[PDB]
Design a protein around this ligand. Structure first.
Ligand SMILES: Nc1ncnc2c1ncn2[C@@H]1O[C@H](COP(=O)(O)OP(=O)(O)O)[C@@H](O)[C@H]1O
Ligand SMILES: O=S(=O)(O)C[C@H](O)CN1CCN(CCO)CC1
Ligand SMILES: OC[C@H]1O[C@H](O)[C@H](O)[C@@H](O)[C@@H]1O
Length: 476
């Protein structure tokens, strides 16, 4: 079984969010579980520079101009790169320019991604051809469309990491992407009178997965599907929709071995976490106090993630004696809002606007609670990281958050399954109740410790995930 992942990011080479973490860890897990998995990425600068053994496989002309297909390895996994400098040789985000504007040629940049994914199924690489093309999110959404147009020389799965990103392009671009014009149909990649790459992936794939069992349910609903629910309901009925929960990469996210930490620690030596908290408080200008709960945010600052709710609840949190350590970027209103709170409440509110990989680890290893009040959450990796680091996740019950966190209810505590705090509704009052629950648990140190150790006992294994994907690939 040979599988090609088609995607736009991969940790540690290029990352804007959780998708990169997944691509950086799944393929190796699949190889251990007996599937020959390879990865296809655009040759973005940071990616090309990481793959130092990359060699030329072939050269082609395409509707978007020439590509050189390269192939190398990273961390033992086979990596293909689409070198097409006129499309991909630009710094920063795969998706937008430095002024945050989508590239005007995005339609070509990502259509080509899909095209090369499909072409691989027809011998683009004379030495290796995938049995399954595994496309991720809209970026790779055309892979299954090109495959369908070519008579399906390989089977395909399309994995939804997030349905809110639809890859919408004007219909006239049908002229530019070398697909049958008959594909521009509601039974095809048309969506509200435009081309949707997401629609294309959902429609043409042999099978669709989502990154958690609950999200796979949710996206058959209008409030999570944003118009796509009819296709997904039909695919569910056809048995062509399923959920497979993400793992966590233990090479990167383990307090036991995390080299980015002032102090490493384990489920049975949580006293060794204290130094991380102390240094986190110092680094952020917080009062150095071990009697007070430190709440953490590592997140995009947006409504999708519920960070407006955090801002609204902040006074309530401060009033009860908690601290906040926040790292993130997003809505300028929220950025400014949080900077204002840090200025207004120095010593209890520490804020850092921007993206900092290493600092996220120091927050994860030092905070007591991580706030993940997502409005929707296909998976929510930061919360799985919280569990592993014994920093209790405080989450809204939606998507993967609902699959993985157990509220500190009486029965969960009694059954020894409690592992964090869960609230229900997307408002500050609802959030504030969970926050109060955390203060109540904090006032009982031995119960807190009990819950920390259960949080750290939870396991999210990529090789277990690989086994589900394998079963799926063989059913296709
Ligand atoms: N400002 C930031 N600094 C460092 N890492 C961040 C920042 N914002 C998000 N991340 C990281 O991005 C990933 C987000 O994954 P996840 O929580 O599943 O959300 P999503 O898939 O929507 O990006 C996590 O690794 C998280 O730690
Ligand atoms: O907004 S864009 O469509 O231009 C950019 C992408 O959709 C960015 N992503 C990456 C993957 N995501 C979810 C999986 O981590 C968030 C959307
Ligand atoms: O965060 C970026 C945005 O992405 C999507 O468009 C969501 O619909 C929105 O809620 C979110 O804030």
């Amino acid at each position: 079984m040979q599988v090609l992942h088609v995607c736009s990011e991969m940790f540690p080479l290029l990352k804007t969010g959780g998708l990169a973490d997944v691509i950086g860890a799944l393929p190796a897990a699949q190889i251990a579980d007996g599937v020959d998995a390879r990865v296809l990425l655009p040759a973005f600068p940071d990616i090309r520079r990481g793959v130092t053994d990359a060699q030329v496989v072939s050269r082609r002309d395409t509707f978007a101009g020439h590509i050189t297909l390269l192939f190398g390895h990273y961390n033992g996994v086979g990596i293909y790169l689409i070198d097409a400098p006129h499309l991909y040789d630009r710094p920063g985000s795969p998706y937008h320019d430095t002024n945050l504007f989508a590239y005007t040629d995005n339609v070509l940049r990502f259509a080509l991604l899909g095209w090369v994914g499909a072409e691989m199924a027809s011998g683009l690489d004379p030495f290796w051809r995938p049995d399954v093309v595994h496309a991720h999110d809209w970026h790779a959404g055309l892979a299954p469309a090109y495959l369908a147009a070519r008579g399906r020389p390989a089977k395909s799965v399309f994995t939804v990491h997030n349905l809110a990103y639809q890859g919408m392009f004007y219909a006239h671009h049908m002229n530019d992407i070398q697909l049958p014009w008959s594909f521009f149909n509601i039974h095809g990649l048309e969506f509200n009178g435009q081309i949707s790459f997401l629609k294309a992936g959902l429609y043409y794939a042999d099978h669709i997965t989502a990154v958690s069992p609950t999200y796979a349910r949710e996206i058959t609903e209008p409030q999570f599907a944003y118009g796509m629910e009819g296709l997904l309901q039909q695919r569910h009925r056809e048995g062509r929709l399923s959920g497979v929960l993400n793992g966590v990469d233990e090479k990167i996210w383990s307090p036991e071995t995390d080299l980015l930490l002032a102090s490493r620690y384990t489920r049975d030596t949580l006293e060794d976490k204290a130094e991380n908290k102390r240094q986190l408080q110092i680094a952020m200008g917080l009062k150095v106090d071990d009697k007070v709960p430190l709440f953490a945010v590592v997140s995009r600052l947006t409504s999708q993630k519920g960070l407006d709710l955090v801002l609204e609840a902040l006074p309530g949190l401060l009033e009860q004696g908690g601290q906040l350590a926040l790292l993130g970027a997003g809505d300028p209103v929220l950025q400014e809002g949080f900077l204002a709170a840090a200025a207004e409440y120095p010593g209890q509110v520490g804020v850092q606007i921007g993206y900092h990989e290493a600092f996220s680890h120091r927050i994860m290893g030092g905070a007591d609670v991580i706030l993940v009040p997502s409005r929707f959450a296909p998976c929510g990796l930061t919360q799985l990281y919280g569990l592993k680091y014994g920093t209790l996740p405080l989450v809204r019950r939606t998507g993967g958050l609902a699959d993985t966190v157990s509220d500190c209810s009486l029965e969960n505590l009694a059954d020894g399954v409690a592992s964090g705090f869960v609230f229900e509704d997307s408002n500050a009052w609802s959030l504030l109740r969970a926050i109060r629950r955390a203060f109540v648990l904090w006032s009982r140190p031995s119960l807190w410790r009990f819950v920390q150790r259960q949080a750290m006992a939870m396991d999210f294994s990529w090789q277990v995930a690989a086994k589900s994907y394998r079963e799926l690939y063989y059913r296709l």
